[model samples]
Target: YNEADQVIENLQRNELTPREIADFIGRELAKGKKKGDIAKEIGKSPAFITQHVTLLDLPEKIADAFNTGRVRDVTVVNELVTAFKKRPEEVEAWLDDDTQEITRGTVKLLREFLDE
Candidate 1:
C-alpha cells in the first residue's frame, strides 16, 4: 500500500489527528510529490491540501494548544494563522491567556483590532 493512500484512508476514517495528516502531506511534498497529484489521489481540492499543509506554520505554542484540545476548529486555527501573520504578539498573548476562548469571533476581533 502506498503511504499517500494510507494517509488518505486514515484521513477519511478520521483516525489521524489534523496535525498528523498535515505532517503526512508535508512529508509527501518534501519527497517531491506534486500537490495536484496528491489532491487528485485524495479527491480533495488542491486548495484543501494546501490549507492543511500550511497548518505546519502555526506557532509552537499555538500548535501545542491544538494538540491539547484548546483549539480544535480548523476555521479558528486558520483565522489564528492569518492573525498571527499580522500581529504575532497579540495572537501569542491571546493564546497564552487561559481565560480566552479559541473562537472565530475572538480571532476576528484581533484582526479587526490590528486593522485599526
Candidate 2:
C-alpha cells in the first residue's frame, strides 16, 4: 500500500519520466508486487505497466537515448529491444553509424535486411 501510494502521489506530480516510471514498476516487481495489482492500483492495464517495465531491458546506448528523451516512442524502442536481442551486430551498426533517431521504418528495414 505504501508503494502504491507513492506511485499515486508521484503520478499526481506529473514529473515522472518514462524511465522513472519503468524503474518504479521494476522495483515493485522485485518486491513481488503483481503487475495486475499494480495496474489496478494505478488505474492502468497490466500490459501498459509491463510494456513500460520492458523498456528497462533496452541496451545501454538505446536505453540512455530513451532515458534522455532522444528516443520518445515506446513502440520503436520495444521493437529495437526485440531486434537487439536477435541481431546485436546490425542494431549496433545502426546505432553507431546510421542515425541517432530510430524509427519504426528503420527497425522494420533492419529486421528485413537481417532475414535476407
Candidate 3:
C-alpha cells in the first residue's frame, strides 16, 4: 500500500524523466525490493517497469527523442526494443537514416528486410 501510494502520488505530480525512473527503480532494488514486488504494489506487471527502464538502453539520442515525444509511443518502443533482440546491424542501419521517419511502414520494411 505504501509503495503504491508513493508511486501514485509521484504520478499525480507529473511525468517522470527516464533517468528519474531508472533512479527510482535502482533505489528500490538496493533496498531489496524486487522488480515484481514493486510492480505488484502498484498493480502493474513486471513488464511495466522493465519496458520503461529498458528505454535507457537505447542511444541517448533515441532515448531523448522518446522522452520528448518525437516518435510514436509503442511503435517506436516495440521496433527499437525488438531491434535490440532481432538484428543489431540492420536496426542500426535503418534508424541511422536521418531522412526517414520512424513509423509503421518503417517497421514493416524492417520485417521484410529480415526475410530475404
Q: Which candidate is the best by TM-score?
A: 1
- Model 1 lDDT tens row, 60-97: 87788787898898778777877788889878888889
- Least well predicted 10-residue stretch by lDDT in candidate 2: 93-102
lDDT of 2 by residue, 50-100 (tens): 678888777896787677777788877887778888888878778776345
Best by lDDT: 1
lDDT against the true structure, per candidate, is 0.81, 0.79, 0.67
TM-score of each: 0.84, 0.76, 0.68
Q: How far is candidate 2 from the true structure (C-alpha RMSD, Å)?
A: 2.6
Clashes of 1: 0
Best-to-worst ranking by TM-score: 1, 2, 3
Give the range where candidate 1 is weakest over 10 consecutive residues by summed lDDT: 101-110
For model 1 the TM-score comes to: 0.84
Model 3 residue runs over 4 Å out of place are: 1-4, 12-14, 17-19, 64-69, 72-75
Pairing residues by index, what is the TM-score of model 3? Answer: 0.68
Per-model clash counts, in order, read 0, 0, 0
Candidate 3, pairs of clashing residues: none
> RMSD for each model, in Å, please?
1.8, 2.6, 3.4
Give the residue spans of candidate 2 off by over 4 A.
9-14, 98-100
